[PDB]
């Protein structure tokens, strides 16, 4: 059975998005496809692995600049982190 899991730093990203006034239904939404392993994922969310210093984790886009940096492994799903480009790579 696959673990679902959130970094630390996930769940202040969450609170920043809520305090930032972001849509948290389409964050729900994506990160409840992904704990039902509904894969794949639709294409709107652009989905695909990183590279660099996120390598081994995914990228999928819940807007233009707002970004879910995830794991998914056979073992564990990982929300690591969520938030702007800058903030998330820069």
Do not use: C
């Amino acid at each position: 059975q696959r673990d679902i899991e959130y970094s630390g730093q996930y769940s202040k990203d969450v609170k920043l998005a809520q305090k930032r006034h972001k849509d948290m239904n389409k964050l729900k939404y994506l990160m409840t496809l992904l704990i039902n392993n509904t894969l794949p994922l639709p294409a709107v969310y652009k989905d695909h692995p990183l590279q660099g210093s996120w390598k081994g984790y995914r990228d999928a886009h819940v807007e233009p600049d707002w970004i879910l940096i995830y794991k998914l492994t056979d073992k564990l799903l990982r929300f690591e982190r969520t938030g702007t480009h800058a903030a998330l790579f820069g």
